[PDB]
Design a protein around this ligand. Structure first.
Ligand SMILES: CCCCCCCCOCCOCCOCCOCCO
Ligand SMILES: CCCCCCCCOCCOCCOCCOCCO
Ligand SMILES: CCCCCCCCOCCOCCOCCOCCO
Lengths: 146, 552
């Protein structure tokens, strides 16, 4: 009937970043480990193994909507993630991804809302990670004879 | 003193309704290559004085940080509105800090304190505006490395309301986490927390909560499917105090020592079916099923400190928590089912996405303190539905949306949609729309559904636009409109022109600021303001109370 479905070249891969223990780094490492991708350090000779560099990330929390009294009703956080796949000998390829989420505010339970803001952000860090790995197929096909 | 600097900055002028004419004359001081300061006299007309806005920035091995202190010795209008105390000084203090020392130590600070709740309503700045309902005061220091992390923090909040400023605070809060991935076929995950909750109101109860949560997870996957099981325990203990008065005021059965242990069983299966289309395009269809079981526990003797109802995104349907925090863990006997459909072009770029999901309840989700006034008493069945979508027709246009529906409300709970046309930084137009039903506000926010400011919910359209008319001139504007009241919430129009090296920038903004009592029911207060500022950057897009965010 209809056929059933990470490339073989990226079954072994390097993960490098200035903040290796950060939320984004651990999220990406966990997610790609779920896909069966083996992780090795750069201490190996490593000429055929591709690299996945995490350039940076930032969260921007702005007011999405406002009530009739001029107070925030719901915030919308946007996580921008910058990465780049490094294929040795075939130049680097940058990747960017966004995660848009939103939640209603409530100053009467501010602490609670903080616990929600920490819960969403974490989830976003995971979601972004997914959106980084699904774009690797688009980076593999970018390698064409020019 | 102040020398070895760059010099005076070019001043800027403003005319607003609450401050009158305003003249800011900044003065920059480059103390060192890694830290500097900025002193800004900011003269205000009808305020009757000069607010001194002080900024300082530093870059150290412990972290990068910024500190702000705005100070006005006396305010005339505020003295007219609040003439009880002769002291009329108004000020703001802000401190941001962030640093990762040796890739393990994490130092963070986000502190905001103001003199009165009506500060950000009158004085706008980068660190607050009229839309803020409370100021945050968080400190955090932790140690993080791969398999283990432990962070200690203190969280406080200054609520901007003279009648009801009751808000809890964690002083302090300890979060510990252990990980180990290859325990046979199981990935383990231990989580522990120790928190001490205190309130500004002494009549509210204090508590010391201890939480222990081990989580074992067995993930299996092949070529087409992925089945992941999970067992999680939730042990919690509460040492509460100061309960007699609160138990007298409200009909509650809070006790000093409360224990609660809950199991949790979750199973999550996922599949994927690829399907090839015309011209080398390739779509895919992924179904996902998840079963969740959590026994019921009577949590009526436990207080509420950091638990609030969550919103169900499409992925949020598969979440194993109804509330935040650890005070209200609802019972579960749920079956979530969902389906996603993506497409790709010849270059395998993800262009279009649709997600539709639902959850079916076998038994009702109880906590022991379920006083959420729903519109109807539907306890079981396919109650909650959700959906998301994203469309990219080319490199310029874009689209994204999402809607969450609930049968207990008999109306769509949440609904946002946004389309955007994005050439570059200077040329773009965006049209968005956000919606929240009165039933949603009534269910999630019991206190706001009574007042006329928040009763009818939200139905707000928005139009942002940055466009240059003449080849060298540039114009930008924004317009937000409320559908229920047929009134505008925020309007903006501004022009900018780079003559040679430094550009001139004129702007205008009108916004909802407050709510006017004593009327024929009630009306909204509006504030107008014009501004003149005299490198090539467009801060006008993010200068409104509803800043512009690119949706691609
Ligand atoms: C009341 C607060 C005063 C405390 C400030 C004392 C900070 C002293 O420790 C700073 C150590 O870091 C030295 C900064 O080195 C330059 C930064 O760039 C170095 C790149 O790693
Ligand atoms: C049937 C549902 C019951 C809920 C599951 C209870 C499981 C109790 O056993 C917990 C044991 O887990 C030990 C913690 O895992 C190790 C994490 O620490 C590793 C250190 O890096
Ligand atoms: C791995 C299961 C995937 C199949 C999806 C549907 C599962 C629905 O069956 C749930 C069985 O539990 C029924 C709950 O029974 C009512 C509660 O009382 C039983 C607790 O003792």
């Amino acid at each position: 009937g209809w056929h059933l479905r990470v490339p073989t070249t990226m079954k072994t891969m390097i993960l490098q970043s200035s903040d290796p223990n950060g939320p984004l780094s651990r999220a990406v490492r966990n997610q790609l480990r779920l896909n069966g991708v083996d992780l090795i350090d750069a201490s190996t000779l490593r000429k055929d193994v591709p690299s996945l560099r995490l350039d940076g990330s930032s969260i921007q929390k702005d007011t999405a909507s406002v009530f009739q009294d001029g107070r925030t009703a719901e915030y919308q956080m946007v996580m921008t993630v910058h990465a780049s796949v490094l294929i040795p000998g075939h130049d680097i390829y940058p990747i960017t991804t966004k995660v848009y989420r939103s939640f209603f505010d409530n100053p009467q339970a501010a602490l609670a809302k903080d616990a929600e803001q920490d819960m969403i952000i974490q989830e976003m860090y995971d979601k972004a990670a997914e959106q980084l790995i699904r774009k690797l197929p688009s980076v593999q096909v970018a390698d064409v004879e020019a | 003193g102040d020398k070895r600097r760059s010099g005076f900055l070019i001043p800027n002028a403003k005319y607003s309704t609450k401050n009158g004419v305003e003249f800011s004359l900044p003065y920059y001081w480059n103390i060192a290559p890694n830290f500097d300061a900025t002193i800004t006299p900011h003269y205000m007309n009808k305020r009757g004085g000069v607010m001194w806005e002080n900024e300082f920035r530093y870059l150290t091995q412990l972290g990068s940080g910024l500190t702000e202190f705005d100070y006005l010795p006396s305010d005339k209008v505020y003295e007219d509105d609040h003439s009880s105390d002769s002291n009329s000084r108004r000020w703001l203090f802000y401190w941001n800090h962030s640093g990762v020392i040796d890739q393990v130590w994490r130092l963070n600070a986000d502190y905001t304190k103001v003199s009165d709740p009506d500060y950000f309503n009158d004085f706008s700045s980068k660190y607050g505006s009229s839309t803020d309902g409370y100021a945050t005061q968080k400190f955090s220091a932790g140690y993080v490395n791969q398999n283990f992390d432990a962070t200690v923090s203190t969280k406080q909040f200054q609520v901007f309301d003279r009648e009801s400023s009751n808000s809890y605070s964690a002083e302090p809060q300890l979060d510990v986490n252990y990980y180990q991935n290859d325990v046979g076929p199981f990935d383990t995950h231990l989580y522990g927390q120790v928190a001490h909750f205190v309130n500004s109101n002494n009549n509210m109860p204090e508590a010391t909560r201890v939480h222990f949560e081990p989580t074992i997870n067995l993930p299996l996957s092949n070529g087409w499917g992925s089945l992941n099981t999970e067992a999680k325990l939730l042990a919690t203990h509460y040492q509460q105090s100061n309960l007699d008065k609160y138990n007298a005021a409200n009909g509650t059965d809070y006790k000093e020592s409360v224990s609660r242990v809950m199991p949790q069983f979750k199973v999550d299966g996922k599949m994927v079916f690829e399907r090839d289309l015309q011209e080398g395009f390739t779509q895919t269809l992924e179904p996902r099923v998840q079963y969740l079981y959590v026994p019921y526990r009577d949590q009526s003797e436990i207080g509420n400190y950091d638990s609030t109802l969550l919103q169900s995104d499409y992925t949020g349907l598969f979440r194993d928590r109804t509330y935040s925090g650890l005070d209200r863990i609802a019972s579960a006997n749920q079956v979530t089912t969902g389906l996603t459909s993506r497409v790709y072009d010849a270059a395998a770029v993800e262009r279009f996405n649709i997600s539709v999901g639902q959850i079916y309840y076998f038994t009702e989700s109880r906590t022991g303190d379920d006083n959420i006034n729903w519109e109807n008493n539907d306890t079981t069945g396919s109650l909650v539905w959700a959906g998301d979508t994203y469309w990219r027709i080319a490199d310029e246009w874009g689209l994204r949306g999402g809607i969450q529906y609930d049968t207990r409300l008999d109306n769509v709970a949440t609904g946002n949609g946004t389309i955007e046309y994005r050439r570059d930084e200077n040329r773009l137009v965006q049209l968005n729309y956000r919606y929240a039903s009165p039933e949603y506000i009534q269910a999630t926010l019991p206190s706001y559904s009574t007042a006329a400011q928040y009763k009818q919910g939200i139905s707000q359209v928005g139009m942002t636009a940055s466009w240059p008319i003449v080849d060298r001139w540039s114009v930008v504007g924004a317009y937000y409109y409320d559908t229920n009241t047929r009134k505008a919430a925020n309007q903006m129009l501004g022009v900018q022109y780079n003559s040679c090296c430094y550009a001139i920038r004129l702007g205008y903004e009108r916004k909802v600021n407050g709510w006017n009592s004593n009327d024929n029911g009630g009306e909204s207060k509006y504030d107008n303001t014009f501004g003149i500022n005299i490198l090539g950057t467009q801060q006008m897009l993010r200068s409104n109370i509803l800043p512009y965010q690119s949706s691609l």
